[PDB]
Amino acid sequence: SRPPLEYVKGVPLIKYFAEALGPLQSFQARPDDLLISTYPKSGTTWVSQILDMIYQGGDLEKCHRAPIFMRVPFLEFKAPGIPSGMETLKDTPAPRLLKTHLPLALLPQTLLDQKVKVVYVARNAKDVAVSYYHFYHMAKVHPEPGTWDSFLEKFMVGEVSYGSWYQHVQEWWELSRTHPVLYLFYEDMKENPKREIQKILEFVGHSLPEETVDFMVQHTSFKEMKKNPMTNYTTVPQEFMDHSISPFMRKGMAGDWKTTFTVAQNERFDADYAEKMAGCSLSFRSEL
Numbered sequence: 001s002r003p004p005l006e007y008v009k010g011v012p013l014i015k016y017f018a019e020a021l022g023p024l025q026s027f028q029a030r031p032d033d034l035l036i037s038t039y040p041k042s043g044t045t046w047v048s049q050i051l052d053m054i055y056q057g058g059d060l061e062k063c064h065r066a067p068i069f070m071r072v073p074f075l076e077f078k079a080p081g082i083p084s085g086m087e088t089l090k091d092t093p094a095p096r097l098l099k100t101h102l103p104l105a106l107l108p109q110t111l112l113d114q115k116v117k118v119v120y121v122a123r124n125a126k127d128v129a130v131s132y133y134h135f136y137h138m139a140k141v142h143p144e145p146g147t148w149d150s151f152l153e154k155f156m157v158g159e160v161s162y163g164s165w166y167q168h169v170q171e172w173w174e175l176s177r178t179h180p181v182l183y184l185f186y187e188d189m190k191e192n193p194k195r196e197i198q199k200i201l202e203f204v205g206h207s208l209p210e211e212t213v214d215f216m217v218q219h220t221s222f223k224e225m226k227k228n229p230m231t232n233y234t235t236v237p238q239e240f241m242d243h244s245i246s247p248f249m250r251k252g253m254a255g256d257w258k259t260t261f262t263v264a265q266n267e268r269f270d271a272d273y274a275e276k277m278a279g280c281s282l283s284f285r286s287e288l
């Protein structure tokens, strides 16, 4: 019940996900797999739903066949009495959509060797930190988040589940130079979802009629996804996620970090961020 993170090769993980790495060593990627890769709270569920709808050719009834966590196996997932990502994967027909948050240091080598297409989604660090603080409260496999101030301090040094946001978004950006990676930003998807759905279509090599793309924009909207029981995580057991503490589909906005960060926290965070992000060519928008 709120166990401590377990470190594996330098990365702090949920203890059950660290145990899941064992069976995951026997995982074999196929060349037509597609991997959705994100640091937590950056738009994983959102891009999973858009990808699954594309894969069903826009058919909303087919997307309702099961919750998003069953349609898109979470590779390192495990929790007591719930089937593991690996067990769910065995029944998943190809072409498969796969989800992970693992740093490159832990990622199954077979996904790089097979040259599997990666949709990566990054989000600005300050909205990730606020989103992640609330998530820690409702998703009970995490350690106690503590106060917002104390969790922010852990976030800045990467002492949270899956480690450093700074290292994650930079290493996957570097990976995109030598591996097929479509690198998206949450904030771009908020600004123009149609434009980003069109880019994902081109990446996976499908085209769909314009009326179908407009239909997907509407069904992958925050409001539609908050009330869809197949995407909003409300079917998972209460002992694992408690939506009365914080909903999974919480606010869905870019820039709302500004009502949580104090001025002092923002000053400290901005000076730390400039050092961490100095050599990187990425640039994030903090608001629209």
Ligand SMILES: Nc1ncnc2c1ncn2[C@@H]1O[C@H](COP(=O)(O)O)[C@@H](OP(=O)(O)O)[C@H]1O
Pocket: 038, 039, 040, 041, 042, 043, 044, 045, 046, 127, 130, 131, 132, 134, 220, 221, 222, 223, 225, 248, 249, 250, 251, 252, 253
């Ligand atoms: N269709 C959508 N549009 C915008 N944001 C969405 C969304 N679906 C989920 N989100 C937001 O993405 C975050 C969850 O990300 P992940 O799926 O990677 O865990 C939450 O952010 P907030 O906590 O800021 O509201 C969630 O509300």
Ligand SMILES: N#Cc1cc2ccc(O)cc2oc1=O
Pocket: 069, 070, 074, 077, 082, 083, 235, 236, 237
């Ligand atoms: N009940 C239940 C379940 C919850 C659940 C949560 C997350 C996940 O990745 C996969 C999951 O599979 C399940 O069967």
Ligand SMILES: N#Cc1cc2ccc(O)cc2oc1=O
Pocket: 040, 041, 044, 079, 101, 139, 140, 141, 236, 240, 241
């Ligand atoms: N229990 C539990 C869960 C933990 C969890 C952690 C990260 C994540 O991206 C999705 C997740 O879904 C879950 O059901």
